[PDB]
C-alpha cells in the first residue's frame, strides 16, 4: 500500500508536503501525492478518515481541535508539542512525529536596518525601543490592532503603546501588504505585521522579533501519521526527524520564498533542500 501524502493548501504546506513526499520516496516508500488538497478543516476531516496518512500541522492547532483555544498551554513551545501528541494519540491514534523549530506565529518583523542600528531581536527590545521614543510605525490590520490578544496583548507584555501616527491600518488581514508597507518605507512604515515564516520577510529584508515573553500561542510544523501507516514504516519517524530539525524560522521563511516570490515549484524546492543538506540524493 501507498503512504498518502497530503498537506493543507498554503505554499508552507506544499513546502513541507513536498519534504515529507521527497524523504519518503528516498528511502523507498512509494507513496501517493494528495499535497495541498484543503483548508485545515478539509484535511482533519481526511486524516481522521482514512483517506489521507501523513501531513505537516501545527502543534497550536491542536488548540481548536481539542476545544482548548483559551487554555494557555499553547503559548508554551513545548507543552502545546506535548498535547497536542498526547490528545491526537489518545482520541484518534494518530502519532505527532519530531517537529520543526519554527515558530509560524502572528509577529512584528522589522526592517533590517532599523533592527542591527538599535541593536532589536526580541519584542522586549521593540518595548524598551518604542517606550524610549523609538522611531516607528507599523503597518498592520486592524483586527491585529484592535483584538485583545493581538497588539494589545503585546503592548501590555512589553511595556509599550503604539499611537494613531505609529500606524498604518489596514481593512483585510493578509500580510502581504503589511509586509510590502515596510519593505517599501510607505508613509514612513519601517515595520509589519507578519506570520513568522511568510516566504515575503526573506527578500523585504525583513526580521521577525523573538516572542520571548510568549504572547502569542506557539504553531510549530510537525509531520503527524496514522498510527497504522507508521507500524507498517516504523523507520519514517526516525528518517523525518533530522530533516525538520533543520527547517528553522529563517530556512522555511526561504523556501516559502522561492515558491510565492521565485516562482519555483515545491517540488523543486523541497529537493533542493534535502539534497544541500544530505537528506536526499
Ligand atoms: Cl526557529
Same mark, same amino acid.
Given at each position: 500500500?501507498?503512504?498518502?501524502?497530503?498537506?493543507?493548501?498554503?505554499?508552507?504546506?506544499?513546502?513541507?508536503?513536498?519534504?515529507?513526499?521527497?524523504?519518503?520516496?528516498? +528511502?523507498?516508500?512509494?507513496?501517493?501525492?494528495?499535497?495541498?488538497?484543503?483548508?485545515?478543516?478539509?484535511?482533519?476531516?481526511?486524516?481522521?478518515?482514512?483517506?489521507?496518512?501523513?501531513?505537516?500541522?501545527?502543534?497550536? $492547532?491542536?488548540?481548536?481541535?481539542?476545544?482548548?483555544?483559551?487554555?494557555?498551554? =499553547?503559548?508554551?513551545?513545548?507543552?502545546?508539542?506535548?498535547?497536542?501528541?498526547?490528545?491526537?494519540?489518545?482520541? $484518534?491514534?494518530?502519532? =505527532?512525529?519530531?517537529?520543526?523549530?519554527?515558530?509560524?506565529? =502572528?509577529?512584528?518583523?522589522?526592517?533590517?536596518?532599523?533592527?542591527?542600528? $538599535?541593536?532589536?531581536?526580541?519584542?522586549?527590545?521593540?518595548?524598551?525601543?518604542?517606550?524610549?521614543?523609538?522611531?516607528?510605525?507599523?503597518?498592520?490590520?486592524?483586527?491585529?490592532?484592535?483584538?485583545?490578544?493581538?497588539?494589545?496583548?503585546?503592548?501590555?507584555?512589553?511595556?509599550?503603546?503604539?499611537?494613531?501616527?505609529?500606524?498604518?491600518?489596514?481593512?483585510?488581514?493578509?500580510?502581504?501588504?503589511?509586509?510590502?508597507?515596510?519593505?517599501?518605507?510607505?508613509? +514612513?512604515? +519601517?515595520?509589519?505585521? @507578519?506570520?513568522?515564516?511568510?516566504?515575503?520577510?526573506?527578500?523585504?529584508?525583513?526580521?521577525?522579533?523573538?516572542?520571548?515573553?510568549?504572547?502569542?500561542?506557539?504553531?510549530?510544523?510537525?509531520?503527524?501519521?496514522?498510527?497504522?501507516?507508521?507500524?507498517?514504516?516504523? +523507520?519514517?519517524?526516525?528518517?523525518?526527524?533530522?530533516?525538520?530539525?533543520?527547517?528553522?524560522?529563517?530556512?522555511?521563511?526561504?523556501? $516559502?520564498?522561492?515558491?510565492? @516570490?521565485?516562482?519555483?515549484?515545491?517540488?523543486?524546492?523541497?529537493?533542493?533542500?534535502?539534497?544541500?543538506?544530505?537528506?536526499?540524493?
Amino acid at each position: 500500500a501507498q503512504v498518502v501524502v497530503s498537506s493543507k493548501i498554503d505554499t508552507e504546506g506544499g513546502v513541507l508536503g513536498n519534504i515529507i513526499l521527497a524523504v519518503l520516496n528516498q +528511502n523507498k516508500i512509494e507513496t501517493t501525492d494528495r499535497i495541498q488538497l484543503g483548508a485545515t478543516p478539509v484535511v482533519r476531516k481526511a486524516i481522521t478518515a482514512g483517506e489521507i496518512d501523513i501531513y505537516p500541522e501545527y502543534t497550536g $492547532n491542536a488548540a481548536f481541535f481539542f476545544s482548548k483555544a483559551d487554555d494557555p498551554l =499553547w503559548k508554551d513551545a513545548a507543552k502545546g508539542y506535548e498535547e497536542a501528541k498526547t490528545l491526537d494519540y489518545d482520541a $484518534n491514534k494518530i502519532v =505527532w512525529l519530531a517537529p520543526s523549530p519554527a515558530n509560524n506565529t =502572528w509577529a512584528i518583523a522589522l526592517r533590517k536596518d532599523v533592527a542591527d542600528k $538599535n541593536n532589536l531581536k526580541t519584542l522586549s527590545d521593540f518595548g524598551k525601543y518604542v517606550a524610549g521614543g523609538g522611531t516607528v510605525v507599523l503597518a498592520a490590520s486592524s483586527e491585529f490592532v484592535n483584538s485583545a490578544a493581538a497588539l494589545p496583548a503585546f503592548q501590555t507584555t512589553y511595556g509599550f503603546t503604539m499611537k494613531p501616527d505609529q500606524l498604518i491600518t489596514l481593512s483585510g488581514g493578509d500580510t502581504a501588504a503589511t509586509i510590502a508597507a515596510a519593505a517599501n518605507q510607505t508613509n +514612513n512604515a +519601517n515595520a509589519a505585521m @507578519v506570520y513568522g515564516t511568510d516566504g515575503g520577510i526573506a527578500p523585504s529584508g525583513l526580521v521577525v522579533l523573538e516572542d520571548d515573553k510568549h504572547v502569542q500561542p506557539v504553531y510549530q510544523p510537525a509531520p503527524i501519521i496514522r498510527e497504522e501507516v507508521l507500524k507498517k514504516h516504523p +523507520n519514517i519517524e526516525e528518517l523525518l526527524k533530522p530533516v525538520f530539525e533543520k527547517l528553522d524560522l529563517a530556512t522555511l521563511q526561504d523556501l $516559502n520564498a522561492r515558491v510565492q @516570490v521565485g516562482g519555483e515549484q515545491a517540488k523543486t524546492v523541497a529537493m533542493d533542500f534535502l539534497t544541500k543538506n544530505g537528506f536526499a540524493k
